[PDB]
Scaffold this active site. Structure first.
Site, PDB file in Angstrom:
ATOM      1  N   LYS A 120       0.829  -1.207   0.000  1.00 41.58           N
ATOM      2  CA  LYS A 120       0.000   0.000   0.000  1.00 41.58           C
ATOM      3  C   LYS A 120       0.864   1.258   0.000  1.00 41.58           C
ATOM      4  O   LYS A 120       0.402   2.344  -0.345  1.00 41.58           O
ATOM      5  CB  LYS A 120      -0.944   0.022   1.204  1.00 41.58           C
ATOM      6  CG  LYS A 120      -2.289  -0.641   0.963  1.00 41.58           C
ATOM      7  CD  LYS A 120      -3.311  -0.197   2.001  1.00 41.58           C
ATOM      8  CE  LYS A 120      -2.898  -0.596   3.409  1.00 41.58           C
ATOM      9  NZ  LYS A 120      -3.835  -0.053   4.434  1.00 41.58           N
ATOM     10  N   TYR A 143       2.036   4.071   7.177  1.00 43.61           N
ATOM     11  CA  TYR A 143       3.295   3.418   6.835  1.00 43.61           C
ATOM     12  C   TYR A 143       4.453   4.410   6.917  1.00 43.61           C
ATOM     13  O   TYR A 143       5.544   4.067   7.373  1.00 43.61           O
ATOM     14  CB  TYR A 143       3.236   2.809   5.432  1.00 43.61           C
ATOM     15  CG  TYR A 143       2.420   1.539   5.317  1.00 43.61           C
ATOM     16  CD1 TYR A 143       1.870   0.933   6.440  1.00 43.61           C
ATOM     17  CD2 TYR A 143       2.210   0.940   4.082  1.00 43.61           C
ATOM     18  CE1 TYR A 143       1.129  -0.231   6.332  1.00 43.61           C
ATOM     19  CE2 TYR A 143       1.472  -0.222   3.965  1.00 43.61           C
ATOM     20  CZ  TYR A 143       0.933  -0.803   5.091  1.00 43.61           C
ATOM     21  OH  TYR A 143       0.197  -1.961   4.977  1.00 43.61           O
TER      22      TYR A 143
HETATM   23  N1  LIG Z   1      -3.119  -9.082   6.025  1.00 46.72           N
HETATM   24  C1  LIG Z   1      -2.620  -8.862   4.809  1.00 46.72           C
HETATM   25  O1  LIG Z   1      -3.022  -9.468   3.830  1.00 46.72           O
HETATM   26  C2  LIG Z   1      -1.529  -7.848   4.624  1.00 46.72           C
HETATM   27  C3  LIG Z   1      -0.863  -7.795   3.407  1.00 46.72           C
HETATM   28  C4  LIG Z   1       0.146  -6.862   3.230  1.00 46.72           C
HETATM   29  C5  LIG Z   1       0.463  -6.010   4.277  1.00 46.72           C
HETATM   30  N2  LIG Z   1      -0.195  -6.072   5.442  1.00 46.72           N
HETATM   31  C6  LIG Z   1       0.210  -5.134   6.490  1.00 46.72           C
HETATM   32  O2  LIG Z   1       0.937  -5.803   7.522  1.00 46.72           O
HETATM   33  C7  LIG Z   1       0.743  -5.116   8.759  1.00 46.72           C
HETATM   34  C8  LIG Z   1       0.355  -6.131   9.820  1.00 46.72           C
HETATM   35  O3  LIG Z   1      -1.032  -6.412   9.653  1.00 46.72           O
HETATM   36  P1  LIG Z   1      -1.608  -7.911   9.672  1.00 46.72           P
HETATM   37  O4  LIG Z   1      -2.553  -8.079   8.507  1.00 46.72           O
HETATM   38  O5  LIG Z   1      -0.451  -8.862   9.864  1.00 46.72           O
HETATM   39  O6  LIG Z   1      -2.467  -7.821  11.028  1.00 46.72           O
HETATM   40  P2  LIG Z   1      -3.548  -8.911  11.502  1.00 46.72           P
HETATM   41  O7  LIG Z   1      -3.239 -10.243  10.861  1.00 46.72           O
HETATM   42  O8  LIG Z   1      -4.921  -8.298  11.378  1.00 46.72           O
HETATM   43  O9  LIG Z   1      -3.177  -8.986  13.065  1.00 46.72           O
HETATM   44  C9  LIG Z   1      -2.976  -7.776  13.793  1.00 46.72           C
HETATM   45  C10 LIG Z   1      -2.363  -8.098  15.147  1.00 46.72           C
HETATM   46  O10 LIG Z   1      -2.149  -6.890  15.885  1.00 46.72           O
HETATM   47  C11 LIG Z   1      -2.733  -7.025  17.182  1.00 46.72           C
HETATM   48  N3  LIG Z   1      -3.240  -5.737  17.713  1.00 46.72           N
HETATM   49  C12 LIG Z   1      -4.081  -4.881  17.101  1.00 46.72           C
HETATM   50  N4  LIG Z   1      -4.341  -3.805  17.892  1.00 46.72           N
HETATM   51  C13 LIG Z   1      -3.655  -3.973  19.040  1.00 46.72           C
HETATM   52  C14 LIG Z   1      -3.474  -3.220  20.306  1.00 46.72           C
HETATM   53  N5  LIG Z   1      -4.095  -2.035  20.515  1.00 46.72           N
HETATM   54  N6  LIG Z   1      -2.667  -3.759  21.246  1.00 46.72           N
HETATM   55  C15 LIG Z   1      -2.042  -4.936  21.056  1.00 46.72           C
HETATM   56  N7  LIG Z   1      -2.158  -5.670  19.937  1.00 46.72           N
HETATM   57  C16 LIG Z   1      -2.937  -5.250  18.914  1.00 46.72           C
HETATM   58  C17 LIG Z   1      -3.868  -8.015  16.996  1.00 46.72           C
HETATM   59  O11 LIG Z   1      -4.220  -8.678  18.207  1.00 46.72           O
HETATM   60  P3  LIG Z   1      -5.712  -8.484  18.789  1.00 46.72           P
HETATM   61  O12 LIG Z   1      -6.601  -9.123  17.750  1.00 46.72           O
HETATM   62  O13 LIG Z   1      -5.692  -9.196  20.120  1.00 46.72           O
HETATM   63  O14 LIG Z   1      -5.856  -6.985  18.888  1.00 46.72           O
HETATM   64  C18 LIG Z   1      -3.308  -8.965  15.961  1.00 46.72           C
HETATM   65  O15 LIG Z   1      -2.560  -9.998  16.608  1.00 46.72           O
HETATM   66  C19 LIG Z   1      -0.365  -4.097   8.533  1.00 46.72           C
HETATM   67  O16 LIG Z   1       0.219  -2.794   8.452  1.00 46.72           O
HETATM   68  C20 LIG Z   1      -0.954  -4.451   7.184  1.00 46.72           C
HETATM   69  O17 LIG Z   1      -1.361  -3.276   6.479  1.00 46.72           O
HETATM   70  C21 LIG Z   1      -1.173  -6.968   5.644  1.00 46.72           C
END
Ligand SMILES: NC(=O)c1ccc[n+]([C@@H]2O[C@H](COP(=O)([O-])OP(=O)(O)OC[C@H]3O[C@@H](n4cnc5c(N)ncnc54)[C@H](OP(=O)(O)O)[C@@H]3O)[C@@H](O)[C@H]2O)c1
Ligand SMILES: NC(=O)c1ccc[n+]([C@@H]2O[C@H](COP(=O)([O-])OP(=O)(O)OC[C@H]3O[C@@H](n4cnc5c(N)ncnc54)[C@H](OP(=O)(O)O)[C@@H]3O)[C@@H](O)[C@H]2O)c1
EC number: 1.3.1.122
Lengths: 353, 353
Positions: A120, A143
């Site tokens: 993104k 980001y």
């Molecule tokens: N998912 C994709 O397909 C993808 C692809 C490319 C890039 N990304 C990027 O990679 C990055 C990581 O995202 P992701 O997709 O890996 O996330 P995700 O799979 O949705 O998981 C997010 C993690 O962060 C934790 N979290 C959220 N708010 C929190 C808080 N206030 N305190 C403590 N923990 C918290 C969540 O735990 P809880 O549920 O307990 O809050 C969860 O374990 C993001 O910036 C995203 O834009 C994602």
């Protein structure tokens, strides 16, 4: 007894849960690893099955984060694989800041900080294939804030850094806010439960364009690689499976995996919102969870139909993996096989029937 | 003094000339290699600079081929990297047959036959990304005849085989019937000579679509790999650089490499034939050859403007490299850097100024 000590922020995440598995493998570079796993929710029963030290902590809360993370003196590597769930630049920045202000003054053996963002960064657009040297778009993107904090904090405290920009992630976590495979598996599951074909709801272009993705395990490998290899230190790095695919081919495989008939894209038809179609399927999913004795998940938590809608109206987002390959990282996945692998794994873990 | 003895059929070719260089390298698998190089023309002066044994032979002539190739008792590996220059299935088949009928009964240590075809196997169309397991199209294609001969001859005589289907080749040979980089370099050279911008003549889609290619050196590595590695024996194998690009990005780099201004694709404009634009530039090229003291080439021989016209009206031809990667072949090239590499090399070899 440990050579390296990892802090996985977002251990329940789609990449975090993979790190929880990969880091604990005997032949993993930098091993043997001790793993602290941080997330906001109480530790899920399926994560309690893993040899990681779970730390329930609201990372957006500075005083709580300081309280729970400052006693962790032995941390050597930080893997920030989280976000707050909104595009808010400030609240996302606070989370990353709180992690850094709590660990850096307390971990005298801290070495490296892994920051996970995404593609993104390139379109919010730049033209593809996206390369790491492309300048920031003149818009607000959290980001950007995360990167600036990374540069500032690692520099002042003599730490190495790495920025990872994965493509669309193929993973297995039922706690992710953006898990495309779990989302489509749930949709397929509901279709078979209601005796209906797997009808493709997306746009024409997303059906027929070249797309890429990255296996959650490969992201973990990529981030571990940057955490231990000198060649990858202080580098911005894309991360995808190294190939391309089309959703038209994935869709057919998805239908075969669930033993149901498929309705591919139909010429002339516009995209339909999956988020709308599945709006009232919460109880149906509860029935499926009970009947199949699955791990208890809410429809809203395991599936992100809004996220599939965005993926199914996107195109021209291919990213380049040349930089990582030229730096020595030769990790790859067959995307078609990776997609099937994620289905099998979520069935394995009894997230889906 | 040699461990392996190669027969390179088409040594002046865009891949054959690369094999002539790669096979003679000290650390090349299966080395040290003895290299027989076969082509129809008298040995070019630039090829005489290479430690290969050149054999001028019309391979379509059975009695001539028998006469010149049967004394070669020590051959262990055959690399067929030729074609006759037409789509004629029978005359192309005769060439490959003549090679086989002349060597197999005479080389008691023959082990393996490398057959080079291409991605045209997939569209003459099948949908992309092209995978090796895609069935033949119900049309006449001399690739089919070559394969059938390969299967038949290697089987009866206890030989291993490998089929290589490279994408568009980025190479340096001035004797190739289909060299896209030399073709575009000549076009750019003529533009700068006439004080004109590098005007993109192709279609809109070819300017903006994802494309792939393969470095000539990588094809050689790929074919050598199959010639020495048990895992690659008796396999059909695609061969590309492992990434994707766009002609819009290549075109800009081409303009920079020649220090001239560029006119990219203009909205609304149709494709123009390069073969028509360059139809009367033979003497201009002769002037450039003389003034720059280049290796004497005819415009028709170093450039294939008709071939660029086809490339600039093509799309959706991406091939998959997953099979080779899963079999252990991790060779790759940055396509943008590969393109620049070919320019520098042809300047190096004084084929272009
Ligand atoms: N998912 C994709 O397909 C993808 C692809 C490319 C890039 N990304 C990027 O990679 C990055 C990581 O995202 P992701 O997709 O890996 O996330 P995700 O799979 O949705 O998981 C997010 C993690 O962060 C934790 N979290 C959220 N708010 C929190 C808080 N206030 N305190 C403590 N923990 C918290 C969540 O735990 P809880 O549920 O307990 O809050 C969860 O374990 C993001 O910036 C995203 O834009 C994602
Ligand atoms: N070029 C590409 O971009 C590309 C890409 C993908 C696949 N392919 C495929 O790869 C295969 C090999 O083609 P290529 O492009 O490598 O060929 P090339 O670069 O045009 O060279 C062809 C070679 O074959 C020799 N040859 C032709 N007719 C002959 C005859 N009667 N007797 C002896 N030698 C003869 C030529 O020598 P003389 O000049 O002396 O005859 C030349 O050395 C083809 O099937 C092609 O379709 C090519």
């Amino acid at each position: 007894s440990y050579k390296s000590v990892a802090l996985v922020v977002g251990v329940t995440g789609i990449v975090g849960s993979s790190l929880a598995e990969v880091l604990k493998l005997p032949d993993t570079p930098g091993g043997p690893w001790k793993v602290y796993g941080v997330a906001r929710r109480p530790c899920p029963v399926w994560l309690a099955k893993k040899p990681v030290e779970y730390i329930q902590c609201d990372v957006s809360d500075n005083q709580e984060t300081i309280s729970k993370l400052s006693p962790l003196k032995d941390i050597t590597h930080i893997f920030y694989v989280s976000w707050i769930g909104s595009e808010d630049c400030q609240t996302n920045a606070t989370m990353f800041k709180n992690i850094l202000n709590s660990v850096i003054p307390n971990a005298s053996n801290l070495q490296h900080v892994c920051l996970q963002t995404g593609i993104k960064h390139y379109f919010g657009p730049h033209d593809s294939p996206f390369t790491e040297d492309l300048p920031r778009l003149n818009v607000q993107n959290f980001y950007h804030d995360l990167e600036d904090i990374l540069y500032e904090e690692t520099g002042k405290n003599n730490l190495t850094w790495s920025i990872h920009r994965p493509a669309l992630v193929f993973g297995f976590s039922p706690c992710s806010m953006m898990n495309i495979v779990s989302t489509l598996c749930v949709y397929a599951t509901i279709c078979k439960h209601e005796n209906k074909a797997l009808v493709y709801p997306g746009s024409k272009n997303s059906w027929n364009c070249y797309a890429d993705a990255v296996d959650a395990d490969l992201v973990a490998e990529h981030e571990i690689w940057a955490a231990v290899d000198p060649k990858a230190k202080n580098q911005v790095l894309n991360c995808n499976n190294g190939d391309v695919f089309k959703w038209k081919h994935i869709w057919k495989k998805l239908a075969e995996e669930f033993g149901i008939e498929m309705v591919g894209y139909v010429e002339g038809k516009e995209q339909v919102s999956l988020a709308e179609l599945m709006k009232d399927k919460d109880q149906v999913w509860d029935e499926i969870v009970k009947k199949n004795n699955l791990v208890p998940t809410k429809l809203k938590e395991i599936a992100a139909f809004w996220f599939a809608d965005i993926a199914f109206c996107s195109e021209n987002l291919i990213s380049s993996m040349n930089k990582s390959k030229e730096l020595g990282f030769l990790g790859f996945r067959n995307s078609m096989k990776s997609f099937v692998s994620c289905i099998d794994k979520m069935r394995d873990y009894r997230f889906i029937p």
